């Protein structure tokens, strides 16, 4: 199979992105980003074991999420900060990997590269950026998750570490982020 490096969170739809890539004949190499602040990659690592997929944690420069924290404090809205982290991350991985994918969904607002942005990336660094969920609305994703996974209400992306930095600074993260996590617990079908 052809190799694809997938930004992976361990959630419902993140796991869906990895499963789709498998069925189309890719060998999905799951990667989760950590900036050496707190080990928030655990959930993703676990669910990758469950998914039956190779997982790796790549550590990046904390400075990236420090700046993100700044942007949160600067804008209140997290969009800009998150756009910054995600983009920078892709630019980084694109210097190592030729085929990249993540779980950006149709209904998502951020992270989300624009058209020119995607083109630029693929052209400048000679890679393929793949977003399998791009064509899939909320209802469809919901249907597909419930066909593929056994799911569960529990109560691994950049948010945990960023929020952590905020706490350290004296800022309440709750102010900058909303309230809602579901866990993939097993397969109903086989990938």
């Amino acid at each position: 199979l052809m190799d694809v490096h997938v930004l992976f969170s361990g959630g419902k739809d993140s796991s869906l992105s990895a499963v789709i890539l498998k069925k189309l004949g890719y060998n999905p190499h799951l990667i989760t980003i950590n900036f050496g602040v707190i080990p928030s990659y655990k959930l993703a690592e676990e669910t990758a074991k469950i998914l039956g997929f190779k997982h790796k944690v790549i550590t990046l420069d904390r400075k990236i999420v420090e700046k993100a924290a700044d942007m949160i404090i600067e804008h209140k809205y997290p969009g800009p900060a998150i756009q910054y982290v995600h983009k920078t991350v892709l630019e980084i991985l694109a210097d190592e990997y030729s085929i990249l994918a993540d779980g950006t969904r149709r209904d998502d607002r951020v992270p989300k590269l624009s058209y020119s942005e995607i083109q630029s990336l693929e052209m400048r660094k000679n890679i393929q950026y793949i977003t399998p969920l791009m064509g899939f609305g909320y209802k469809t994703l919901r249907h597909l998750a419930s066909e593929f996974f056994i799911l569960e209400e529990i109560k691994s992306d950049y948010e945990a570490e960023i929020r952590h930095i905020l706490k350290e600074r004296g800022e309440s993260p709750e102010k900058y982020f909303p309230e809602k996590q579901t866990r993939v617990v097993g397969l109903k079908k086989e990938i």
Copy 2:
């Protein structure tokens, strides 16, 4: 098992959309629009047989293409005309099938629904619209096509492709226009490189 109705032209991309839907557990019902001008759907038919998918042709009012013809005559490039037809097809089909799919893709500007057009379409018609290829770019699709399909080139003006083009092209001819001016290759899915 969940049905889905897939606008289908018979090209390798369109075929990839079918195949993907099937990978995800859907029962794909390939459909090709016809406007009663000419039987340009023949290609899509043969291809569905080869893919092993159920196929149907849906006949729509010829005025839809008559207007696409008018629009071509004045825009001279087909974009606006293609948009108008495909949008019109979706509205009509959305009254009959609650899960609609097509072969729209990341690197084709046209045809393509905007996000706001999509949200409107789904809410007004209480429907699911699915675009498997939207997240895949030119190069990725080129690679996927060659992995799933045996392929061959169709030389310019022999076989008729099964999208709106041919039927539009035809009206333009009748009209005393020159089609080579606006619609001056073709790649045939000849077989499968592996089970779907």
